[PDB]
Amino acid sequence: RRKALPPRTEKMAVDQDWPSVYPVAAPFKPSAVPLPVRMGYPVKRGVPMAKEGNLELLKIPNFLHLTPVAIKRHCEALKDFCTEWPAALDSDEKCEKHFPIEIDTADYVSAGPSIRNPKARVVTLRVKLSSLNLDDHAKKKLIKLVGDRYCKSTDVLTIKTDRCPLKRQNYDYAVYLLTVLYHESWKTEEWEKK
Amino acid sequence: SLWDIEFAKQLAAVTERPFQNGFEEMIQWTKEGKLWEFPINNEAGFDDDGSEFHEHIFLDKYLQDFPKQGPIRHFMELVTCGLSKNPYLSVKQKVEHIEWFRNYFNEKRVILKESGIQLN
Amino acid sequence: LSEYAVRMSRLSARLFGEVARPTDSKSMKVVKLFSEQPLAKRKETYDWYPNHNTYFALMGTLRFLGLYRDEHQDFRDEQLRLKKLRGKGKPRKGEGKRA
């Protein structure tokens, strides 16, 4: 007892909302898409293959769930979760005066069962030496204390931490190194007099 | 109490339902744990026993029972520096690494005294 | 190279967590042995081969319970049955040589 059903194309409404049809990622089932679309290399006397039984149409990623109307409807519902950016920091010049420390953090995503990526542990710290309270002696000591991690032309000190397994451990290690560098650039020891 | 579990399963019998939407499918599987924690960070589910940077970088506190002025300190400082730059191992593994050298040196006592250097 | 410079370099290594006192390049090898994970402990090395025993046993068991169908194993079984019917089968262990 075989039974063949006409697809949803004959029942699709002209003004039906498409986010209701394709809310999330789908394998592009041809019975749910009333759009007659032909994908494939044509034959000399033939035409490109229709949507039924077409493997090329299934291979490609479908963005039917990301139509502009659906994107509008989704983004409107997300406005309640976001917070407003302060207008007092529109230009970088005041951002450098108020928050001079920059923390470069890397986040990664990959398809598979695994999450752990060894490149995620690296944390970068960038601080401008023109926004600190170093004097001449402590500055000239700090330059030689850091070495090549300070850019003389741009006047930025970079601290790249990898030694800690976790991102938070790398971060608090980096702030500890910044504090220790600041404190040790101030102490004048016996051997500095020679 | 098994009766609490029976009441909970009687509640879950009417709470649960075959899925009506892909969004609900992902919500249920996220509550179960199958779907990833979005936004995806590479350190989810791994706390490393709640350790901090001072437990990984500073291992000098484990070198107290060794000769301070001998070549054992010269070798253990390189071992400690190597272990402190190692993000692939947890703190307990480094503790065991130090303890291995500890017991090896405390076991082989005749060779250190025969080598001509006074070691403990 | 000066006394001031070598003191600065010694302080820099102590502050950054590097090797403080002078050591030879051949001696930095033991620093390196612990600075990274050894070859035998890397997942790319000790997890190289998937468990073919699990794969083969699982597929055989589902074939026996009738949920997976192994066409290659069916072909082998049919060929062996034809071989045993024609009369050249697998001899018993211990009688091939002497008997």
């Binding site: 220790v180 | 001072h54 500073f58 | 010694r10 102590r14």
Partner: peptide, 18 residues
């Protein structure tokens, strides 16, 4: 030759790395 004494415990206690 000469070795300089570095206060590691004091720095760790001061800046929270003990």
């Amino acid at each position: 030759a000469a070795a300089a004494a570095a206060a590691a415990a004091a720095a760790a206690a001061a800046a929270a790395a003990a």
